[PDB]
């Protein structure tokens, strides 16, 4: 319940400002590698909860090969969490591989649902 | 890597299978738990 347009607007306002980016991007990636979802072999777009119909739409949108890769990363994360270990350091998701791959599908589903709601509640230009 | 090359299980396999030994030890332990559970239920 963050409505990805809103978080994208705040994040782009932080990134486009030089002072705010220089201040809280080191805090940002320090937060990321203290979060430790890399160490289970996951990406952050593999981590967004997908039990609402807009994210379910954005998972139908997704290409096939990225869907099979996402399915493998989920099953290796469940198996590694089951054994209570971590993946070895060669198998951790690196910083360059943590690509926001599912974000544009999510954002276009956001814009579609927002436009549907606006047009479902319009007045008339009298 | 093929799907016919099984990965390494050799650190966790028994060095001797002997399919009456392993099943007898397992059924002995399950039977001991059932023994004490029968006593406790009584």
């Amino acid at each position: 319940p963050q409505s990805f347009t809103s978080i994208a607007r705040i994040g782009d306002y932080i990134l486009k400002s030089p002072v705010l980016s220089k201040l809280c991007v080191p805090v940002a990636n320090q937060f990321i590698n203290l979060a430790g979802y890399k160490k289970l072999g996951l990406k952050f777009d593999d981590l967004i909860a997908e039990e609402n119909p807009i994210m379910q739409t954005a998972l139908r949108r997704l290409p096939e090969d990225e869907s099979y890769a996402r399915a493998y990363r989920i099953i290796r994360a469940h198996q590694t969490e089951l054994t209570h270990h971590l993946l070895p350091r060669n198998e951790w998701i690196k910083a360059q591989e943590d690509v926001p791959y599912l974000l544009p599908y999510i954002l276009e589903a956001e814009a579609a649902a927002k436009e549907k709601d606006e047009l479902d509640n319009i007045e008339v230009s009298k | 890597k093929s799907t016919y090359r099984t990965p390494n299980f050799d650190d966790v396999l028994k060095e001797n299978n002997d399919a009456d030994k392993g099943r007898s030890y397992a059924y002995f332990m399950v039977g001991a738990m059932g023994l004490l559970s029968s006593a406790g239920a009584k």
Binding site: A77, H78, Q79, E81, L82 | -
Partner: protein, 55 residues
Amino acid sequence: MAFRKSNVYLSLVNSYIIDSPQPSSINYWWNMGSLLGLCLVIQIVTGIFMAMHYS
């Protein structure tokens, strides 16, 4: 099909405590529910056998 699936009563026992698909990564914190069920059965059975002597 099997008798645990075709019977009316055993289908609930099946679909709840036999063939219920559980996620394979859940730790011991997903066990407090069964533990609360056992402790509720303890409370009820001791309550009956102790309320046979209570005025």
